């Protein structure tokens, strides 16, 4: 039959380790700016090993395990981060719509000023 | 354990626990009494027989404030007008849903997904000093997620 | 060219239309009388005719997919497929009193939770009650056979289990108390009587069996003689962990409590049957290890890939011998040279293995096969030049005197690179791209001394690494 | 030789001894909890939710039990679920979960 | 460079299982051998101190031999690098 | 936390979980208190000579796995125990050759360990020295699983008597070590605990302890001390043989199990081949006024069979309430997929039991053991042992044997209802005579229900007792008007009652029963 794997959200969908850096380069700017649109929670025990699991019962998706990954700038999961510490998320369908843009017209990125 | 629950919830009204209706959902749970008129109808569509439809019901149910009005009574009911009010606009667009309950009768038979579709009752019941309600008879009509199967649904039962 | 025949529904209906030609009988037809019976006549054509299609079609050789066709496929080709051998290993004996004999020989059983049978095949020699043998998941089955009749390749087969688990056969003509042991074999060779055994033989009954030949091609047992069949079995792959404990039985019923068999080094890695098809194909692509020898080429590349460490191996005729001889010669008739070169051999061993794998491998006609000398030919490099100061002269010398002759040395590969049975000249412009692909050379000028140029037949070109001339200094100021 | 067994290793192949299987299935369903396994760490019993609860609230065993058994089946359609018995014991420490797709009537001790 | 690493998402029975411990730490074994010590160059490229020594010649060379110091004390070579590095602006003295 | 998973339980609580193992086993069940089965087997565990109660939560469990088929004859009466144990409940009695010891561990007055072995039956006696011993009870030689202690000291009584905590456990050969119970106990006599149970040592070895049982010198247990012991081994006990069991163990199981007071409605035969425990097991269902299920040896063909019966010589009038049958193929092991052979009366009495107590108010026994309603057995891989021999229905029918065959759908059916009545009359059927036997056993009930009671009441009590009775029967239908209302009339039953003297009430009844059609015939005729 006509079958193929894949899955419409990766990041990493975008092969360039580069654009993949700046991708994660401003969405550490958002995070760790200030935002109202952002979530407001704190740090969990468990957090360690599983810094996704926050993202599974807040939003039922591992997607945003890189996301929380930038954001504690953890050198691995089996060091742990401190609970507390100040934690913002964005909506999932801002995150979605920017890497549809990147991905299918992401060329001028910063500014459009005029055709 | 379970969140908030309302109506004859606890032991304490020394009743049988057999004859309690029971919904509970992820944050609420309502018990009430198996009142008369109760009623159900499953059925199907053809014309050469095309299809079926899902399960319906017809719950009425009666509920006595018989030492706590605000748990029995008024909470009972904010409670159902809450689960039957499609909440789509609480700030999380990303997934709302008008919410269904699961329904327990008898203790044994086991409804995991139906939902409200209808509510009615009366409110003209007398009341007491602070005003809340003795007694009220709220029926309802519920609906099956789906059109069950012959193997989904015999095989429910206890 | 081809066959056809129509389908049942047709068949059915020209046959009512046929025997509706007489009218006292013809309207029989619609009535489950008329149906039954024609189902009855196209039910038995149908076997006959798809059966007689399927009789043909399992007539091929890569068609056949039942066990039993492919054996007899396999039969047919001189080929056995691999049947499974059952894991062998060490098990820990302990004696439990002093009853318990300190030799316990081979030849007997052990019985698993499973009752798996055990043969052991050495002697148990309990030390201080303690004793090892080697133990593995055998059974001897036991027939035998009377000699029916002398017909040639007279048949005797066996039971479907005993085809299904002969992982091994011994066949012992005992005739009246005298035994001989007959076994099967195959490629025919030399005139007359070759051997007084029998032949393989399957049926595809899902059978295995002998034959019992005549003549020159074995001899046929007398009349009343016997035959006994000792089928070596077993179960297949066997897993045998450490931390059990056995149950012999039979002699060692009574020794049971006596004997303890204890298991402590792990038994496994044995063998199943694979499937029918790579079966099939293994059977039909054997043939390519036959030693199927035509030509000197041939002969090189089988000594080549029987002899390692071969630094070269190369034959020439008649022919190559007159060429480079340029003239006749009364002694180059059918005779072929062959030279060759092993770092780890001298000419006369290389001589001596060519003529050990001559007499090996029977395969030639009027032609004489001699060993020629193979001449070294070394050749000196002078490099001369500077390289940069941020390199060592000694470490770049030594370098590239192991690059050199591991590439072109005196007992480099390149000669037969793909170890086909080819010998390849060293050239000056392979040895100093060799060099120029090292790139340790910054400003470097190269020349050769005593060029022994080799004819390529059997003088042994190479580098003389050692006597290089290495003018190596640093591009200063 | 050295047997094995279905704790997370395997009970069959395949689901040829059907009625069997599927209660294999639930139990290496059942002996995990949350946080205890990658991808859905919500996959598995849900003991940490229904762990030690007053054995006489029967509201809330009821709800608990509903709970449960809904989202183990939207979890595994496969199997869907056909008997579920709750029965103390001889002293107030022992309760035994009893599930029964039809015939297998497996039960486990729990503990409230 | 995990120290029972899987013992987080693992039930504690299957953690004491004896084949378990032996699949993690084989694995354990295996990332240690032949991931980690890329992550350990990496680590060391992150400090101009701390880079290995295969990464310090591949700097070096990477612009050439003529622009480098033939010296044995590798110790030295990062922080004589950083003088190189830091001396292109007052280099003309 | 719950993350936490233990394997024994102490003081600390948390949730446990099997271990990683090689082999498990599992029984659960509730009991049936409806009807009952009995009869004599060879099984792993279990005291000798002794009754069990199995149902389906001890079927696995106190029963031990079952054995190698090979290993023996003694494969029958596990394969039939685990057909019947899947939907009915027994009384299974079981006993084992003499040859079969069991071990016991001693405690000297210092309490060192000394290690013994002695023939299940024989009772061990302290001398001066061996303080005392305890040896194991449940029939394991302890070799598969081994059976470990651990003792050391705990503490105190309210009364201050200084205690000892032992734990007793199973290790497997792969390591796994299952603990079976932890207790404190006390030498002293009057050793009460906080929760006034009593910590004496045989006391609680009798009460909770369920496996090992000790001897304890009444003149030296003062005296006696503790000492830290852990696991500790039994070793000698053996299992004996089992494929040959004296005929003594075979009367001594039929006597225990005629004494037996326990209810059981039918008896099987296990597979047993000895004709003189064929013979008492069939007096004893002649006595007991009950159904039997004996079966003949499978490996021998219908020409000898058919007479097999007689030379069993169950043949008569008062084997007249039992069913002999014969089971001349092979199936797959459902474990060792290997050719077994095994009877049919776990299968056939199971039959009986789930169709009689179809109805609800008191069952109906007129149920036919043959067509597929019951008759439904295949089990794998059926093999005939001797194909081309088939049996014939005449001479089987008079040997009061019972033959089968193969359904339409593949299953194995039982094509015969008739009992080991050698007369041709009503008796010969199968439902009948238990039909018979109900309404006897009820009548007897009753009877003893109403016994001892003054005059002048008793007529009265009896025959309304008898007329409700009638009323159930003509409810089950098993009640059904005469064939000759020449001579009866409709009215299918008759009673009376008179007296003798101070005692002696006879009463007398009788009854019309309905039948199943046993006599099979059939003939259509054309018209052209």
């Known amino acids: ?115 | 354990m379970a969140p908030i629950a309302y109506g004859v919830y606890s032991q304490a009204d020394g009743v049988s626990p057999y004859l309690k209706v029971t919904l509970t959902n992820s944050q609420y749970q309502v018990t009430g009494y198996i009142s008369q008129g109760a009623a159900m109808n499953m059925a199907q569509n053809w014309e050469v027989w095309e299809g079926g439809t899902p399960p319906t019901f017809t719950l009425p149910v009666t509920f006595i404030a018989l030492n706590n009005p605000f748990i029995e009574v008024s909470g009972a009911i904010a409670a159902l007008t809450a689960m039957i009010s499609p909440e789509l606009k609480a700030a999380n667009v990303g997934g709302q849903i008008p919410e269904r309950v699961t329904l327990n009768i008898g203790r044994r038979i086991n409804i995991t997904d139906v939902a409200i579709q209808d509510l009615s009752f009366d409110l003209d019941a007398p009341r007491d000093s602070n005003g809340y309600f003795l007694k009220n008879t709220v029926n309802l009509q519920l609906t099956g997620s789906s059109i069950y199967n012959s193997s989904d649904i015999v095989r429910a039962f206890q | 060219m081809s066959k056809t025949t129509p389908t049942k529904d047709s068949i059915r209906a020209e046959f009512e239309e046929l025997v509706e030609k007489d009218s006292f009988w013809s309207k029989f037809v619609g009535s489950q009388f008329v149906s039954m019976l024609t189902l009855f006549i196209t039910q038995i054509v149908y076997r006959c005719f798809q059966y007689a299609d399927a009789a043909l079609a399992e007539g091929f050789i890569s068609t056949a997919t039942r066990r039993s066709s492919i054996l007899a496929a396999a039969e047919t080709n001189s080929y056995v497929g691999t049947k499974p051998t059952p894991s062998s290993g060490m098990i820990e004996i302990t004696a439990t009193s002093e009853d318990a004999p300190a030799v316990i020989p081979k030849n007997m059983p052990l019985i698993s939770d499973d009752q798996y049978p055990y043969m052991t095949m050495d002697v148990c020699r309990l030390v201080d009650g303690t004793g090892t043998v080697e133990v593995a998941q055998l059974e001897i089955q036991e027939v035998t056979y009377t000699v029916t009749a002398a017909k040639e390749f007279l048949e005797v087969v066996l039971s479907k289990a005993l085809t299904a688990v002969c992982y091994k056969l011994e066949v012992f003509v005992t005739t009246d108390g005298k035994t001989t042991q007959w076994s099967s074999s195959t490629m025919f060779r030399l005139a007359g009587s070759k051997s007084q055994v029998y032949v393989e033989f399957y049926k595809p009954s899902e059978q295995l069996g002998v034959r019992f030949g005549d003549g020159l091609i074995g001899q046929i047992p007398p009349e009343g003689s016997t035959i006994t069949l000792k089928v070596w079995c077993t179960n297949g792959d066997i897993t045998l962990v450490a931390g059990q404990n056995l149950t012999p039985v039979d002699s060692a019923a009574n020794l049971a409590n006596l004997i303890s068999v204890k298991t402590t080094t792990p038994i496994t890695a044995g063998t199943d049957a694979e499937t029918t098809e790579i079966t099939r194909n293994r059977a039909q692509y054997y043939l390519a290890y036959d030693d199927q020898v035509v030509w000197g080429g041939d002969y090189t590349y089988f000594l080549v890939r029987n002899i390692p460490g071969l630094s070269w191996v190369k034959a020439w005729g008649e022919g190559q011998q007159e060429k480079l001889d340029g003239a006749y010669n009364v002694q180059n008739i059918n005779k072929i040279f062959i030279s060759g070169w092993h770092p780890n051999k001298s000419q006369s061993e290389l001589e001596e293995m060519i003529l050990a794998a001559f007499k090996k491998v029977p395969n030639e006609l009027n032609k004489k096969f001699s060993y020629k000398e193979v001449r070294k030919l070394p050749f000196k490099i002078t490099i001369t030049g500077r390289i940069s100061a941020s390199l060592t002269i000694e470490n770049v010398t030594d370098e590239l005197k192991s690059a050199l002759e591991t590439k072109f040395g005196r007992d480099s590969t390149f000669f037969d690179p793909n170890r086909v049975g080819k010998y390849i000249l060293i050239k000056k412009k392979d040895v100093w791209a060799f060099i120029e692909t090292l790139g340790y050379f910054r400003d470097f000028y190269l020349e050769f001394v005593e060029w022994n140029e080799s004819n390529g037949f059997y003088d042994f070109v190479y580098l003389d690494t050692e006597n290089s001339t290495f003018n190596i200094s640093y591009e200063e100021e | 030789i050295d047997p094995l067994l279905t704790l997370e290793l395997s009970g069959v192949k395949t689901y040829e001894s059907q009625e069997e299987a599927w209660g294999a299935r639930l139990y290496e369903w059942l002996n995990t909890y949350q946080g205890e396994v990658y991808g859905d760490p919500s996959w598995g019993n849900v003991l940490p939710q229904f762990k030690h609860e007053p054995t006489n609230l029967s509201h809330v065993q009821i709800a608990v039990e509903a709970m449960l058994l809904q989202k183990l089946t939207v979890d595994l359609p496969d199997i869907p679920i056909s008997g579920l018995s709750v029965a103390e014991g001889d002293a107030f420490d022992k309760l035994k979960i009893s599930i029964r797709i039809r015939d297998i009537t497996i039960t486990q001790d729990v503990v409230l | 460079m995990q120290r029972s690493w899987f013992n987080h998402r693992l039930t504690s029975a299957k953690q004491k299982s004896l084949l378990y411990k032996s699949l993690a730490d084989l694995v354990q074994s295996m990332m240690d051998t032949f991931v980690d010590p890329w992550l350990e160059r990496i680590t060391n490229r992150k400090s101009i101190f701390s880079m290995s020594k295969e990464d310090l010649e591949t700097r070096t060379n990477e612009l050439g031999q003529f622009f480098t110091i033939r010296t044995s004390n590798s110790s030295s070579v990062p922080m004589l690098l950083q003088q190189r590095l830091d001396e292109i602006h007052f280099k003309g003295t | 936390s719950q993350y936490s998973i233990q394997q024994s339980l102490g003081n600390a609580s948390g949730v446990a979980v099997s271990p990683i193992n090689a082999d498990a086993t599992l029984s659960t069940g509730v009991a049936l208190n409806s009807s009952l089965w009995a009869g004599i087997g060879v099984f792993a565990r279990g005291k000798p000579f002794t009754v069990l109660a199995v149902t389906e939560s001890n079927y696995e469990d106190v029963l031990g796995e079952p054995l190698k088929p090979s290993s023996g004859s003694q494969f029958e009466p596990i394969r039939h125990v685990y057909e019947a144990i899947q939907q009915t409940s027994g009384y299974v009695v079981r006993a084992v050759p003499d040859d079969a010891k069991f071990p016991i561990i001693m405690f000297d007055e210092s309490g060192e360990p000394a290690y013994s072995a002695l023939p299940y039956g024989s009772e061990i006696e302290l001398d001066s020295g061996e303080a005392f011993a305890i040896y194991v009870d449940d029939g394991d030689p302890c070799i598969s699983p081994t059976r470990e202690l651990t003792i050391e000291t705990a503490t105190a009584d309210s009364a201050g008597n200084e205690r000892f905590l032992l734990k007793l456990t199973q290790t497997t050969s792969l390591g796994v070590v299952t603990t079976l119970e932890t207790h404190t106990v006390s030498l002293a006599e009057e050793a009460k605990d906080d929760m006034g149970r009593l910590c004496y040592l045989p006391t609680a070895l009798e009460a909770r302890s369920k496996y090992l049982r000790a001897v304890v010198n009444e003149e030296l247990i003062s005296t006696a001390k503790v000492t830290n012991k852990k696991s500790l081994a039994f070793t000698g006990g053996t299992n004996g043989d089992q494929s040959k069991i004296s005929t003594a163990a075979y009367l001594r199981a039929v006597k225990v199990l005629n004494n037996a007071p326990y209810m059981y409605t039918a008896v099987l035969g296990l597979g047993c081949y000895d004709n003189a425990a064929i013979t008492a097991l069939g007096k004893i269902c002649a006595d007991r006024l009950i159904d039997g299920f004996f079966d003949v040896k499978p490996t021998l063909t219908y020409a000898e069979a058919l007479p097999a019966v007689e030379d069993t010589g169950l043949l008569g009038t008062d084997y007249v309430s039992c069913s002999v049958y014969h089971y001349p193929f092979s199936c797959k092991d459902k474990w060792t997929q290997s050719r077994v052979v095994f009877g049919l009366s776990g299968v056939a009495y199971a039959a009986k039991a789930r169709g009689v107590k179809k109805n609800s108010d008191v069952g109906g026994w007129h149920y036919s053991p043959a067509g597929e309603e019951r008759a439904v057995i295949a089990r794998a891989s059926i093999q005939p042992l001797y194909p081309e021999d088939t049996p014939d229905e005449e001479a089987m029918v008079k040997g009061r044997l019972n033959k089968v065959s193969v359904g339409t759908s593949g299953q194995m059916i039982i094509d015969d209802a008739l009992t080991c009545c050698t007369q041709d009359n009503y008796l010969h059927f199968q439902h009948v005579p238990s039909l018979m036997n109900a309404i006897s056993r009820f009548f007897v009930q009753l009877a003893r229900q109403m016994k001892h009671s003054p005059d002048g009441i008793t007529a009265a009590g009896l025959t309304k007792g008898m007329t409700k009775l009638l009323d159930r029967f003509v409810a089950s239908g098993a009640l059904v008007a005469p064939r000759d209302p020449d001579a009866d009339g409709t009215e299918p039953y008759v009673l009376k009652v008179t007296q003798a003297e101070f005692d002696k009430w006879e009463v007398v009844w009788a009854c019309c029963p309905t039948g199943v059609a046993r006599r099979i015939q059939g003939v259509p005729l054309l018209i052209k």
Not at chain 1, 1 to 10: A, E, H, I, K, M
């Open chain 1, 1 to 115: 039959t006509r079958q193929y794997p894949l899955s419409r959200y990766d990041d990493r969908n975008i092969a360039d380790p580069i654009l993949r850096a700046e991708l994660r380069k401003e969405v550490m700017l958002m995070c760790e700016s200030n935002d109202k649109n952002l979530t407001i929670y704190y740090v969990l025990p468990d957090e360690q090993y599983r810094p996704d699991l926050l993202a599974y019962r807040m939003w039922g998706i591992a997607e945003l395990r890189w996301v929380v990954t930038l954001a504690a700038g953890l050198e691995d999961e089996s060091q742990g981060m401190t609970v507390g510490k100040k934690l913002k998320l964005p909506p999932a369908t801002w995150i979605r719509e920017m890497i549809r843009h990147f991905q299918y017209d992401g060329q001028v990125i910063g500014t459009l000023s005029i055709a």
